[PDB]
């Protein structure tokens, strides 16, 4: 219907002599070694759209026929996506046949309107003691995860998947935004060998959809993969009525890819180097992760801080949406404590006596006080001696040392390689024991 006018890298101009496709509509290119999907970014005038490509544009000719699909990128959605790897345009990557779609849904969608919003602000209980006591997760919130390598972040992700799918009966989506393919394959294998993803005829019993956009994909492809994972979660929220988890892995790479897309489209960059639409491209994503009257989506988004600078506009704009932060640190991890959640560094907007109650609030604030006044006599432990202390401060040391032991917990998904079985912990048990 249309034809390619320009190819400037990942940016293609298509000329429609008929009627132009809408903005954010998906275009398919007729005749190309891989299926090339273009997403319409703007109308340039003189019957030309400017599009961003979801794959490589090498071998694209001026005048190639381009078919408008009349809608945005529609992805297979439903329970038949569980345990599958799906890319940004919906194709199966896991090489296990087509995806059994209950429906196809456009990945572009406005946020739930003001009357569909819920006003309740309650706990999503996770079964992990440290992130249900000291930093509770809001049901329908966004959670920063300041982890890294070797702090047990992957085991924490699949434990959150397993615990929410077991207790709350809601599935999970992993949005691999800008992932290393080595790490994405490692996550896929660790989800296979821990039972949160099953294969073959047991595919339907799996608990998580993987939506992957690699690093070697063009910036339009990995700028939209979080929207694909959000559509897969939004079906479970809207149509199934569940409490879904979303794992936007490295929300900073979402920001980076939208910055690159805005730069390739010719836009003048704002502060430090970012897109002028940084807050708006972030709020377009983060406002669809809410609680509706049907169900909720909760996000555990990994957060990267660029120059170890929390005032950089990408983490400063991201932290305006986060309702909780879960800091995984190495110092807690090489102390043997798993999960390696830093109990003092982890924060929650939910930790407030008007939403969790005065009992949970005072127990958590007391545990924080005990751990904090233990962790600021450490520079008098070493220079004076452990038995130099008063008789009351040794009581606080003996209480905090057995508190920070009690924050550790064996995970149900970790029992295929640790031997010890995993213990789900309820909220009342956590508050009463602590």
């Amino acid at each position: 219907a249309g034809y390619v006018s320009q190819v400037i890298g990942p940016v293609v101009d298509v000329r429609f002599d008929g009627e132009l496709p809408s903005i954010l509509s998906s275009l398919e290119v007729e005749g190309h070694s891989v299926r090339l999907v273009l997403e319409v970014a703007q109308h340039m005038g003189d019957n030309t759209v400017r599009c961003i490509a979801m794959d490589s544009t090498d071998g694209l000719v001026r005048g190639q026929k381009v078919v408008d699909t009349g809608s945005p990128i529609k992805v297979p959605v439903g329970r038949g996506t569980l345990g599958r790897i799906m890319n940004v345009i919906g194709e199966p990557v896991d090489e296990q046949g087509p995806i059994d779609a209950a429906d196809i849904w456009s990945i572009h969608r406005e946020a739930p309107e003001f009357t569909e919003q819920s006003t309740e602000q309650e706990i999503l209980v996770t079964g992990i003691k440290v992130v249900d006591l000291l930093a509770p997760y809001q049901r329908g919130g966004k959670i920063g995860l300041f982890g890294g390598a070797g702090v047990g972040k992957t085991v924490l992700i699949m434990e959150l998947i397993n615990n929410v799918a077991k207790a709350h009966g809601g599935f999970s989506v992993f949005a691999g935004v800008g992932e290393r393919t080595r790490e994405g394959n490692d996550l896929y294998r660790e989800m296979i060998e821990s039972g949160v993803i099953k294969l073959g005829a047991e595919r339907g019993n799996s608990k998580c959809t993987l939506v992957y956009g690699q690093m070697n994909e063009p910036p339009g492809a990995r700028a939209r993969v979080a929207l694909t994972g959000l559509t897969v979660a939004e079906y479970f929220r809207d149509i199934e009525g569940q409490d879904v988890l979303l794992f936007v892995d490295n929300i900073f790479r979402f920001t980076q890819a939208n910055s690159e897309v805005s730069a390739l489209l010719g836009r003048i960059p704002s502060a430090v180097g970012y897109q002028p639409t940084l807050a708006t491209d972030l709020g377009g994503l983060q406002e669809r992760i809410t609680t509706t009257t049907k169900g909720s989506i909760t996000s555990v988004q990994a957060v990267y801080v660029p120059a170890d600078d929390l005032t950089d506009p990408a983490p400063a704009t991201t932290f305006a949406h986060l309702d909780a932060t879960t800091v995984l640190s190495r110092s807690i991890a090489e102390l043997g404590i798993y999960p390696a959640v830093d109990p003092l560094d982890s924060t929650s907007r939910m930790l407030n006596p008007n939403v969790i109650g005065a009992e949970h609030y005072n127990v958590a604030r007391g545990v924080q006080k005990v751990l904090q006044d233990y962790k600021n006599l450490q520079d008098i432990i070493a220079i004076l001696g452990m038995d130099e202390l008063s008789e009351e401060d040794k009581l606080t040391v003996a209480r905090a040392r057995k508190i920070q032991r009690f924050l550790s917990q064996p995970f149900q998904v970790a029992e295929v390689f640790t031997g010890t079985p995993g213990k789900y912990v309820d909220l009342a048990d956590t508050i009463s024991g602590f």
């Binding site: 002599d17 005038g45 003189d46 019957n47």
Partner: protein, 114 residues
């Protein structure tokens, strides 16, 4: 190939169309034949609104804009170089460049008229 020299060097993108229109009308010896039918089209844009809609409207199709032009220039004072010009000026929406290309055609003419 070859082309005759222009009398005076002049400006760009509308005054180099006029240089080339003078440079092919000097070879076909119809130098003052192209000039009056350039003045006719300026009169044609004056009293026809549907002919200047093919020069100013951005929403006319580029195929419709070039098919009206060839379907009114059929072998009547055609001159073959103000007829192949107007397809090439309706192929790119440059029919609005006519009031600019004839002014540069005139100043190339009296430099030929000495």
């Amino acid at each position: 190939l070859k082309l005759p020299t222009a009398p005076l060097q002049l400006s760009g993108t509308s005054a180099q169309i006029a240089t080339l229109l003078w440079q092919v009308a000097a070879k076909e010896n119809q130098l003052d034949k192209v000039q009056d039918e350039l003045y006719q089209f300026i009169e044609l844009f004056k009293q026809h609104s549907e002919l200047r809609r093919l020069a100013t409207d951005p929403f006319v199709p580029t195929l419709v804009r070039t098919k009206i032009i060839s379907s009114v220039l059929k072998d009547s004072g055609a001159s073959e170089i103000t007829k192949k010009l107007f397809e090439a000026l309706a192929d790119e929406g440059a029919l609005s460049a006519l009031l600019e290309v004839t002014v540069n055609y005139e100043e190339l003419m009296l430099a030929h008229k000495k």
